[PDB]
Amino acid sequence: QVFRFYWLDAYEDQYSQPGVVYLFGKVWIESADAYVSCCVSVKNIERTVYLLPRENRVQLSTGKDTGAPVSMMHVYQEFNEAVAEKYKIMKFKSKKVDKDYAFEIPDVPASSEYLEVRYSADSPQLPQDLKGETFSHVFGTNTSSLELFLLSRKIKGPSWLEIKSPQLSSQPMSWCKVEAVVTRPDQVSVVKDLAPPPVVVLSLSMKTVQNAKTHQNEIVAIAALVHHTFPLDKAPPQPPFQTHFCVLSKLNDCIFPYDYNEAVKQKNANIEIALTERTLLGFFLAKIHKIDPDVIVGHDIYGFDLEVLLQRINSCKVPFWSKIGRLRRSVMPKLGGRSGFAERNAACGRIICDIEISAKELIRCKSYHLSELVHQILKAERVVIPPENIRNAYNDSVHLLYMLENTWIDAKFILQIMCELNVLPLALQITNIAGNVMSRTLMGGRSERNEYLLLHAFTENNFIVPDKPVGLVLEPKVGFYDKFILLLDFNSLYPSIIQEYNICFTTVHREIPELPHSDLEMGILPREIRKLVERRRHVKQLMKQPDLNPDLYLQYDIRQKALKLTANSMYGCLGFSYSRFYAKPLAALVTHQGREILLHTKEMVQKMNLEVIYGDTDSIMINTNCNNLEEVFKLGNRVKSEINKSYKLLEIDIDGIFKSLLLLKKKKYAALTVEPTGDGKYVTKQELKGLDIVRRDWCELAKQAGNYVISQILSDQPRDSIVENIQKKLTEIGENVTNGTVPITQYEINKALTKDPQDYPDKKSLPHVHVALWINSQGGRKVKAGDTISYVICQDGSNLSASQRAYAQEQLQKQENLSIDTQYYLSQQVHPVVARICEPIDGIDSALIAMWLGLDPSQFRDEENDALLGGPSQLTDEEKYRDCERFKFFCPKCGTENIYDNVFDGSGLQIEPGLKRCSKPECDASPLDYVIQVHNKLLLDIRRYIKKYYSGWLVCEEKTCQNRTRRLPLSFSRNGPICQACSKATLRSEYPEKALYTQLCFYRFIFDWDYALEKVVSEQERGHLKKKLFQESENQYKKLKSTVDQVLSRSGYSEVNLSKLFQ
Template identity: 25%
Template sequence: RDPVVAIAIATTDSVEVLTGKEGEILDYFVKKIQEVDPDIIASFKGNRFHWPYLLKRAEIRKIKLHIDRRGGEPHQSLYGHFSIAGRAHFDLFDVVEEWQDVKVKTLDNMAKYLRLLPQDYEPMTEVDIRDLWRTPEGQQQVVQAFRTYAELILKITQEVLPFAIELSKLVGLPLDHVMTAATGFRVEAYLQRIAYRLKELAPPRVSERIYVKYRGGLVMAPKPGLYENIIFYDFSAMYPSLMMKYNLSPDTFIEPSEEVPEGEFYEAPEVHHKFRKKPTGLIPLALKHLLKMRKSIKNKLSKVTQDSIEYRLLKNQEKAVKVVTNAMYGYMGWSGARWFKREVSEATAAFGRATITRAIELAKQIGFEVIYSDTDSICVKGNEKKAAKFVQLIKKELGMEIKEDKRYTRALFTEAKKRYAGLLPDGTLDVVGLEVVRGDWSNVAKKVQEDCIRVLLQTKSPQAVIDRLRGWIERIKNKQVKFQDFIFWKSITRRLEDYEARAPHVVVAQELVRRGWRISVGDKVGYVVVKGSGRLYEKVKPYFLASYDELDIDYYIDKQVIPAVARILEPFGIREQELEIAKKPPKSTLAAFFQ
């Protein structure tokens, strides 16, 4: 069952699709790798599917996948990834897992994000492959699709590999480990290198440690509404800067029972944890080293042209340094960390809250209207003259750098934290936290909301939004929206038998398993809501087993589209039930609804 029918291999010289009998395909695959002798073998979901599957099929055929440089087979290693001795296995899925802008983690979406595929490209589904493989003509289409996928894996690898290499060099984890390792392990590997240079022993790892929650950054609830001329400011590496400024580190922490003379320690506000001023702790030393590297990289960047190889290399180095620097604070509060010290994280967050509180006071002092603040950023309504003065004032009063992050010519803030949208000076729509950018809503809801946000920001008219919503509802009812836009994508986060609630995506996954599909933790399941009675989980189907006529259009309008638009009209006092007017003929107006 489920034999290998084709394997696509792309090298820098050629692209080849192997077809034929399974044993012959596997034999040739081994010989091809031995012949090419690559240093790096890239895949997409190789760790989660392809290597386990190929090894199993090879075992059935009594073939050894002797593709490593010791004459052995791929084997599962430390972080669950598959290692190939003498070569680096690079799984692109581990890379895209960290890309928050790519909601559905597929090869084609990754390629679209990197602009290697057009946005309207429709990938071949597993069902398409199954059906097409039944005819010679269909097989040719599948082979061509496999050729495209192999080429994409090669092109994407060429784009993202330099960053992975730089990250590997920085933290000291092998290339095939570094992208599969959690952020905490990357930081820890870097700290171990620093500790070794300082001739310090790394603390042992504690397998069982009780995690205690602590208060994080300060988030000021936004003032809902539409605003003109909005500026966002970000503190440059706020938490790393505070950790260096106040020497926050496990080895500088003063236990409550210790007595230290006044003037020889820093005390964190609110939590009152104390840290010695001298000597400099391991964490501040590690951060200073990282920031020194970053400054050196920026200096070198200013001396090379943007189209040069040196520029791209330096940008990847800079990104690697930034990733580790920004993760240091979170690492200190990670219960699995060797250098775990909750008091360091609590003190850092406390100094951060005090810093942002003072920044808000200074912003108001110079005449800014503060609209919103979040952890290490502040959003104000102001003008150019005050903007420059504010940056100087922060530097003088707090001894920290703050920089302008972005500007909106017009912005919408909802009642919820971390959910707003604005028009950038070039007319680009920037959305944060709303359904448009979240992965748990249907695409039709996202498209309608994004379009309505743009209308609202351009016209400042809730009525114009309702008119646009009405147009979308008519298009949905008239089947003028693509079937794909009705699909929900949800991740399987645990074994199916471990789910207690009957969530729609779990029910669909169980149905797929009954039909012979392999569903593993981390897989995304696509489904649609169809007509019928009962609870939601009783009205879902795998998307490829449903037709357009089966879709429950009323559900999508009432539970997806209207709530998504209601979210952006909340600041104007318009609720979901009031948007029922959009389902009526165009002559209806908002005012008429209340008559």
Template identity: 25%
Template structure:
């Protein structure tokens, strides 16, 4: 008997079972997570092949005419298949005959949801089995279920010297558990001991199945924790049956990129580092210790490059402290996710776009989920994958700056510039191809690189308008998560249209966005300068201008508001004159720097780009300078911040710089002289050049090899700490390495480059100030 339920889709799957396609979803309900198998599933694709060229009498295949057209303006047919294997064979047959196929790569489990406008929330009807754990013959539609997620924070500890698993820590609210390998008896609360790895891993499987987490979070949890656990499962011959119904998980590493992926039926794994980057958060270092320090003012219990030795000692000698260390990492991740509402952000993105809950990125998938159903309703199918050479579009507008020290610098920003351009100028994949085919000028809006857009056929501007309205509503309601999620989605549209991994990519589309941005910034600059402003810099969607130094802060704010209103009026009038279109462009004025520094390119007179410092509301702001970059030392950041405090507040810089260098030479800043830089690829891939952090990483691995330890940096994608000693670059492994620092290097490469530009603008010679210090060396 059929029963209906409401729930939230946790994971989605398709596969051939006994020659037939099986599409099923794991859906979280009030009664638990259940498996929902779709009735009469099919997979399909479109083609411009005529029906007579298609197999029409093969069981499991059905070919039909449609009213849909391709972007080449051909009428297309649809081929429906009852298995993935049949579809693969039919696609190969069609291509062999020289015809095109469309949308053949869309997974059937994704298409089923996309065409029914199902995102995460779902209602379904199906026949439950005796246990109620599986529903068959099911159908889904959009629902309104709000899940109460059971979230686990997971962290493992390993033996570096033996490459073995030591423990698995889990926290979930008040629940705190550590499973640890030890032969010593222990009576420690929440600590469960096992005599070997096999017993621990078997217990972990039972623990997961019993307590059924929906979402597992961690720090590099896929790339390290799950990857290591998977290796130990395989080494010990254990099947990792951690799915909701005992399905084995799948952890794999992509050969080309080295990226690790994990799939667990009915569960979601979210990595903290990835979630931060997708959410637009930037840190000098994404290490758990650094992020937790910045966000929570809390640290790991053990830090430093040699902490693995202390971890192994605690495991042998102080099991309670070892367990506390393991759990602290879990707790820190929990608190970071909670503070930034990262799970709420991810669920909101799913609710808006229909991407899988386990997919943190997915800009292309988000776009296609939103665009393709609208395209189909308009009578068209997505374009075939093009083999045309990728042509990059011009980047954002960046003008040469006018270097100097300023007062009263006003910054104007276009609100959501690229989405506003899409909406105002009808930039759209379908509108472009229709404009090419129709020999008429009526309704056309000019683009760039030969493009034009037929406004009556434009889909994307309407989608942007709906999202923009939803964002304004979210702002009024105080729903910051929804507002931010919509912003991420809208801002991704330009990147998607300019990416060769998107089926809708065309150079004319992305160029019609960025080059229009260039034009709008240029026109706005002209309108401002006609009214007495001096534009000293422009970047993508922003213009920096100066007015009279004599204006009070209140007068400067009012002048900025007046100038904003004038430019917005000019934009509206120009759009009407240009193509009889309504302007959805909005210039905003939000920032006034009472003091401002625009540097030159180092060693030149030409103004720099994307680098400046300013004082606004009593707060120092750095962009692109050493204080905001991760590849300079903490010493450089300290020096730059303190130097600009002296510059902007008119303090004695000469005395400050001289005292700073004296303190440096006296060893007061030794712990701030450590460089930290990320390896972006495996060490073996650095063949043409050997940057300092690469040399340091190789030296560190050589030291580990002599100690009988496995390499730490060989695979890359790790942050390397190093210093400059009198012998040159060496890895920073312990404080003993700080005994022979090359202070001259830090003066020449960290202090002088920062001070020289500022002193030059003030007609001062920093070398004269530092000469007595050099004599001390």
């Protein structure tokens, strides 16, 4: 008897049953004319271990070579005598094998003969660090049974497998229709060329509610959409589902509405009413068992749905939790811990598709919440029932039916997003190319996907695979660009580097290792990357053929996408520390070569009179400087040619075109995306990335101002017209505000109360908390957390900060002593929202915007450009010290302040040291007399500045956040600490180290007699100052400079350790 079945998933339990692996899949039944789920148990997978012989026998006690050549008979004898019995190994098979090894373990020859020992999986496991007198290392001690099986039988992803001499299980082991057992793994063979079977897909959504008392999420509704024959090689079906079911429950003393049953029946749907959560979960498990989906698709299914399901099953004491999966398990899986939610295998034997992970892999979006995915992929609108409304829906049957329909619509959206992205065909192709388990392909994250490609490649070439473990950025050129902008995709950079330079585990010696010599033949990893690239090229060439079947076109498109994804992901095997194949030298070499390529590309583009306005290992953003799209395409082709000339295997593509671009940061820009319709005509679409304001307490005035500014920027007009229009609108808004023509409703600011107002530590500085406290004091409906406070900043003649002058609108209309603080509404509401978009434009600054609004610019006043104009090292003294506080000394006699900013005061023969005469003409006191006081004041000022620096105040760089905190968070982006108020901008030091260093340098400057004489002072003035009558002043100034010199000598910013730089 031969058992043919198409396998989809595998499960291994190393601790429970050694040497047994379960394969789940489809088996054709003629009695039913349909495919049914089947579980096949493969047992007796023997541990395979490789013992590495030594050159000369070594006495382990002393560690000294005995000089006796070690043949493999010696290793066999040592294993049979010492190792075999010492670890309770009874029966084993030994053999001599020739294997290669080019991985990260010292003292293992590239090619060598090993003793291969195969013994049952029930026997104990040898230590990883096992060593003997005859053998030095032991490989493969912890190899998993599933890995051994897949690599031994050459099973690469889902496929049709034939089983010879299948048996019948004594007792059911799975929740599958058919079961079979194979005693020897050699009985499973890979059939070829047959088509995949259809699969059952179940899209699942559930509504839960948080219990304020038990602090747990109670599943209150579940909706499921089922397609029983879902293709994996054809186009997604229309409609994507055939059947569906829904289950609804009451929320534990939230009784159903009077006529729930009648309404549900009238709806004429497959709705089941459960009187308890326990019954709901039992019904769900029964339905999952009966339907038996091969794929369950959800949103955040790994992280939320499955975890909540298991918690509610073990809380309500629901039997047969394992019906969620396919294997009969008694003990629930351990919590995620470090591995993650996905790597728990709650639904073992079922492929769980989380559209969050799949979307993150296959499509770029502003966010991966379900509503955003619905908006971007399906171009639809998704209605979110607020949490407080779910429990209020149990008042009317209509509301409850609406909630259930919302769950059904969410399931439909999940299935539609899965179908549109073609997640399942792509997962199948990726699994087949890599040769791993499909479940781990759809898990994502750190799950093994390309490690299996490398494992197959190395095993096919007589290698001992390693045991499983147990980037330059061209910073954005912020600004506005009215010319076409070219986006080039460099995702193929690292595979191209590996191919071109022949970087491999076998070609690089393991500081960044030197490049392999050109004489060496291609390595295994470069060969695999080349195979993938050439396969994609062949598939694309076949696709270019005209008059082709659309179905085959879709198949080839999916295959090409899978090949590209695999090729681009290959690098992760070498780069990631958790990788099975982690090789720090190889990753470092690849990164260094990538840096070189990026810098050379920048140089080329610059030589072509174009501008690289952004650059990263994944993309390049170039300023074409052209107003014609045809010339843009020509320049793109020319750039591709110039790059390919210096790097043949680096293949680049154009990822998009922008007609206009306001760029503040990668992921922070506004642009006019260009979609070319052919024949030189295109369509422009606005695209704003990263411009949303996290803070929602903004008056409508500021929101409208920002919207108008963005509209002007994203118009096809030149720069001058845009700036003129912006100035017009800002002046108009300022005049309207000052003339009181603005509707009062547009001054209202709404802010949510996330706590009781008395519980805010910073209540004094918070205006909405002030208004909430006032509201509570009045004696009406007290405002608790979750309430929205509306307020207007009003001037009342109090000389109090704007936070204290916050009033409710009714109070403003009633008191008659309250007026809207127009200055606040123009400086703190409109100006930030407008400058966050207008400041990047060259020629517009915050001061100019303030001037246009009608404010006082006085209150609002790139390294490459600095180098082009002299650099930080060639600044004049005035520019170097223009932000430094000057030395203030109060005269002991008259008490008038003296400001010192230079060593010398006056011109010509009237020039004398500053500390010689008081600034008050009527005062005859000489500060040089009270030099002890000057010394003390200098020390106090130095202490003040050091305290300011060590205060460690941080401000958010975002104008619309400007969060000020003393606490440095451990959460860092590539640019620095991530602001915890908005979670999207970097925290910058208010008083950086450079500021303190420059302040101390300035205090040294204002007492540097010699420097002032040489540089600052003129010729005649120098002559007049280089005589006697000033020697005492010179000595006192030298003493005073000694203090600042002493302080600076203790500063780490003023010293460069050349030993640390050059090594």
